[PDB]
Amino acid sequence: APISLPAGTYTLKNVSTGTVLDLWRGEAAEGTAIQGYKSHGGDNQKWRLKWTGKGNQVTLQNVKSGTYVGTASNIQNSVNVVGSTTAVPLDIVAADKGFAIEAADHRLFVLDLKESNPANETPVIYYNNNATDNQKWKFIDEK
Amino acid sequence: APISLPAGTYTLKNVSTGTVLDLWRGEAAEGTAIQGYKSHGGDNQKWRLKWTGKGNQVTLQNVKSGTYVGTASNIQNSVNVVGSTTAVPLDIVAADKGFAIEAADHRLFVLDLKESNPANETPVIYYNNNATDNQKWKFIDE
Ligand SMILES: CC(=O)N[C@@H]1[C@@H](O)[C@@H](O)[C@@H](CO)O[C@H]1O
Ligand SMILES: CC(=O)N[C@@H]1[C@@H](O)[C@@H](O)[C@@H](CO)O[C@H]1O
Ligand SMILES: CC(=O)N[C@@H]1[C@@H](O)[C@@H](O)[C@@H](CO)O[C@H]1O
């Protein structure tokens, strides 16, 4: 009424665990692990959603580090999601709960909280989209 | 606040024109036109959103007719979107304004308000996703 997902800063909360998308210590170094972690409201747990101007593609950028949701190597199953100066372009797709986050140039793969594990520092990885709950993210807007 | 697009009944308003997704007289016959039309709040301008259980795919069902966003022939450019007993599976993709509505098994093609034309009874068609504003839809929950 209307429902929109505007460009802005988001807390990203895993549907399965209630844990949030977390950049390891908020560090800017290339390859810094992106993981599930207990929500604490810190900037390393905030992400800027922005459209690139190519189709409906977006990027996600860590507020603390300034680095982007990226990849540890060539995107395929079980590849780590990592903070990177090179953003992996994403598509944000409406799911039965929250949204799926697909790699826009590798659409078979989505951001995946590994094995629905609620423990801190559980890896987020690229994985085949099976539309399981651990592959869905609630977008919580910061106003 | 947690932005969700829940299964529910929706008005879908084209970003470019401001006209809404409209099933011609809410008629249930196969092949009935789906089009842009000025918003009057009637049930033929309301759509049920539901996940099919395959991936993140959904369907859109007209409240008035009970028929679905569908097609009368295989999806390519300028193929018309029509009301049908057989739903075309869809993907709802977040756009810079509103949402794009892709054909789930033909992702290059999205619901498109022809020529960004705000005239009543402008046809909605399947078209090449260019991410133009006539290919984006605002979801108004009721
Ligand atoms: C407030 C803050 O930055 N806490 C982070 C935490 O979120 C997590 O990244 C952890 C490493 O797993 O390091 C901590 O310093
Ligand atoms: C109030 C109402 O239902 N108006 C409908 C309109 O939405 C549209 O479908 C038109 C056919 O183009 O028929 C009208 O009867
Ligand atoms: C015949 C046809 O498909 N018409 C397209 C329309 O779909 C739309 O994308 C528009 C841009 O507003 O360009 C038109 O030429």
Resolution in angstrom units = 2.2
Q: Breaks in chain A follow which residues, C to N over 2.5 Å?
A: none
Structural contact between residues A133 and A16, judged by C-beta atoms closer than 8 angstroms: yes
* A-B contacts at Cβ under 8 angstroms: 83
For chain B, domain boundaries: 1-142
Closest CA to B83 of B39, B30, B125, B130: B30
Neighbouring C-alpha atoms within 13 Å toward the C-beta of A89: 11
Determine whether A116 is exposed, middle or buried from the number of CB atoms within 10 Å of its CB (0-12, 13-18, 19+).
middle
Residues 6+ apart with CB under 8 A from A40: none
Tell me whether residues B56 and A95 touch, CB distance under 8 A: yes
Token pair of A65 as six digits: 């580090």
Architecture of domain B1-142: Trefoil (2.80)
Q: H or E stretch including B141?
A: strand B137-141
User: What spacing in Å lies between the alpha carbon of B113 and ligand 2's midpoint?
Assistant: 17
> What CATH number matches the domain at A1-143, 1.10.1370.40, 3.40.50.280, 3.30.1490.20, 2.80.10.50?
2.80.10.50
**Pairing relationship of beta strands A47-51 and A32-37 according to DSSP bridges:** unpaired
Backbone angles phi, psi at B114, to 5 degrees: -50, 125
Residues of A with CB under 8 A from a CB of B: 1-5, 7, 13, 51, 54-56, 58, 91-100, 107, 129-131, 138-141, 143
Residues 6+ apart with CB under 8 A from A130: B55
